[PDB]
């Protein structure tokens, strides 16, 4: 029951109603993430969402969803309490400006700054967050999704009120829902309670990929954390699933897992001849119009970083040559399962449906995605590999024990032979 409803105003209510859902959730999203910020007001979108999500809930779980592109509040409740949750968020939005005007942001800013610092403490989140910025340096997409410390303390109620009035508008906002409930009842409940100002959809600020390297050598850490990625296909791109399929070809790996010695990806077998890497993760991060395809890796040995980057990038070359049918069949199946796994929780599908409805204007159910992935032949992957991987510029990030990570020209040169 993916059906959509457009209120008297331009707000679209997209609901993935489905029986046998363990719990239901509703969330209002407006397409203003760090993408739609600038360095002076960075993190305002996260801060203004946290303030709204911090409001008292009538037994519902308000949580803030913060992302590069979209941002909103999500309420999770049992299936019978969904309508109360729906009316709740409409109350939050209609009173958004009033709530923020009187709200004291000092405590919220402390929470947001603590979040941003905690992101920096965690090496993977730092590496990925740095990786995304380095690729898009100079554009708004480079801004951290939760912002940075020094940026946050300069935030003031005026900054967020300007942000909400610009972005929290009918044309730039969507309402997402999921669970075992009647769609019409939720839609009627929202219409009778949601009152938000009209406005034009803010133009999405452009961003362009720039291959670069950001090194944060940290000799005190126990392991070397590195991520290498290229300009992968983002949302609303016909290769969106193809990029995910390519990533699953190399998949994931964790040296201390019972599956390590017995996993399919070739790179996994290669790295175990020397225990080169402790864990690595291939991913296809996709934004509204831009995507980053690559891997993340944690290396517990100072002397094997170059070996991994050499072997991992060598394996990327095989996308355009000598890629096996079995690998594609494996990657297609793995992606399909991973795609379906993300949509299990009602919370996750609510976030997902909100993202697509904002950033692409339409959504594909698993039925359509499976029909698309199933049609991916080996040639399509190889053509994509040549297009997006072979001899294409990479972006490199790394924080710990980076001394052995050879400089750009070495890693970049490995992308072609």
């Amino acid at each position: 029951g993916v059906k959509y409803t457009t209120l008297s105003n331009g707000v679209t209510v997209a609901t993935e109603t489905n029986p046998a859902a363990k719990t239901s959730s509703v969330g209002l999203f407006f397409g203003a993430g760090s993408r739609s910020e600038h360095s002076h007001s960075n993190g305002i979108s996260a801060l203004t969402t946290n303030v709204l999500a911090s409001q008292s809930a009538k037994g519902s779980l308000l949580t803030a969803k913060n992302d590069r592109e979209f941002n909103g509040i999500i309420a999770q409740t049992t299936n019978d309490n969904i309508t109360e949750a729906g009316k709740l968020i409409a109350s939050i939005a209609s009173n958004a400006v009033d709530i923020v005007e009187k709200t004291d942001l000092t405590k919220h800013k402390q929470y947001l700054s603590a979040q941003a610092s905690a992101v920096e403490a965690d090496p993977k989140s730092k590496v990925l967050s740095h990786l995304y910025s380095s690729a898009f340096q100079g554009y708004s997409l480079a801004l951290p999704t939760l912002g940075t410390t020094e940026s946050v303390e300069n935030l003031e109620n005026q900054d967020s009120l300007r942000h909400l009035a610009k972005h929290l508008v009918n044309n730039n906002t969507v309402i997402a829902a999921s669970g075992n409930f009647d769609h019409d009842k939720l839609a009627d409940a929202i219409e009778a309670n949601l009152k938000i100002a009209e406005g034009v959809k803010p133009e999405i600020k452009p961003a362009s990929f720039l291959g670069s390297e950001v090194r944060m050598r940290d000799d005190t850490l126990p392991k070397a954390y590195i991520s290498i990625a290229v300009h992968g296909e983002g949302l609303n791109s016909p290769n969106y699933y193809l990029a995910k399929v390519a990533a699953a070809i190399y998949g994931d790996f964790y040296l201390h897992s019972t599956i390590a010695k017995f996993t399919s990806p070739k790179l996994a077998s290669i790295v175990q001849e020397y225990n080169i890497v402790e864990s690595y993760n291939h991913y296809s991060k996709s934004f509204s119009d831009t995507g980053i395809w690559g891997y993340y890796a944690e290396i517990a040995d100072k002397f094997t970083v170059d070996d991994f980057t050499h072997f991992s990038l060598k394996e990327w070359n095989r996308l355009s040559i000598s890629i096996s049918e079995a690998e594609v069949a494996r990657a297609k199946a793995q992606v399909k399962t991973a795609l379906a796994k993300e949509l299990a929780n009602s919370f996750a599908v609510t976030s997902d449906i909100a993202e697509k409805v904002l950033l692409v204007g339409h959504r594909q159910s698993l039925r359509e995605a499976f029909e698309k992935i199933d049609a991916i032949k080996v040639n399509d992957v190889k053509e994509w590999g040549k297009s997006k991987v072979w001899d294409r510029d990479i972006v490199i990030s790394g924080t710990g024990l980076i001394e052995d990570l050879l400089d750009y020209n070495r890693n970049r040169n490995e992308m072609a032979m």
Binding site: L406, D407, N409, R410, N413
Partner: protein, 97 residues
């Protein structure tokens, strides 16, 4: 080869005269291509001398068939031994020289 190993044990110095360990780069490609630049410059100048002016560095008298009975007016080494031979000329004693 021995000189290369004695170099490799401690590595090469730098103009600043401080530890290079803070910022090292692999010899390939950077310094390989710098070596190619200097090699092509050297070969270009070497070609200038070899083809267009080969005998300027040498001494003309060396093209006279040697005979012990005739002493040339000036017994002098090639240019690059001159600094040492000068010393040999300056010191009176042959052993001291």
């Amino acid at each position: 080869c021995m000189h290369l190993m004695a170099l490799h044990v401690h590595g090469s110095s730098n103009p600043v005269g401080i530890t290079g360990n803070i910022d090292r780069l692999p010899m390939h490609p950077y310094f390989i291509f710098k070596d190619l630049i200097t090699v092509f410059v050297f070969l270009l100048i070497f070609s200038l001398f070899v083809f267009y002016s080969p005998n300027t560095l040498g001494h003309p008298d060396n093209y006279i068939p040697g005979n012990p009975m005739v002493t040339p007016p000036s017994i002098v080494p090639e240019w690059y031994l001159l600094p040492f031979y000068a010393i040999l000329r300056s010191i009176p004693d042959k052993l001291g020289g």
